Design a protein around this ligand. Structure first.
Ligand SMILES: CCCCCCCCC(=O)O
Length: 133
């Protein structure tokens, strides 16, 4: 179900990430640095447990979760959120909730590239990742 998402992915295109970060209240200096990083995202499974690593020269994160089971998460920008990840229409949908706010992180495979769509408020960011061999 999740298996074509698995592997190591590198950022190769980003649209509106500053808008997304600014909507979340990320400070200008953090948004500068983040606008020039190209993270590596690593998605692995072990049975029902998925681990998603995001690595860069600026911030690293790692989460582990079971699909469809809520988990606590502390995001790269230090939000303490309630999260759930599920498959919906073949897309991996990550919903974060905190302080009555939500944001979605939706991953879809198109022509072998992983497209991550980030939505918070009205801001919609699209980031494209290509698979590492
Ligand atoms: C400044 C941090 C905003 C939340 C995480 C952004 C994740 C983006 C990515 O995985 O490409």
């Amino acid at each position: 179900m999740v298996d074509a998402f698995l592997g190591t992915w590198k950022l190769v295109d980003s649209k509106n990430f500053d808008d997304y970060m600014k909507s979340l209240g990320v400070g200008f200096a953090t948004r500068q640095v983040a606008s020039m990083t190209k993270p590596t995202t690593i998605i692995e499974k072990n049975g029902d447990i998925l681990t998603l690593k995001t690595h860069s020269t600026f911030k690293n994160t790692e989460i582990s979760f079971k699909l469809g089971v809520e988990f606590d998460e502390t995001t790269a920008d230090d939000r303490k959120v309630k999260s759930i990840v599920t498959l919906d229409g073949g897309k991996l949908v990550h919903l974060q909730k905190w302080d009555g706010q939500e944001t979605t992180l939706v991953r879809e495979l198109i022509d072998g590239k992983l497209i991550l769509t980030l939505t918070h408020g009205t801001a919609v960011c699209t980031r494209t990742y290509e698979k590492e061999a």
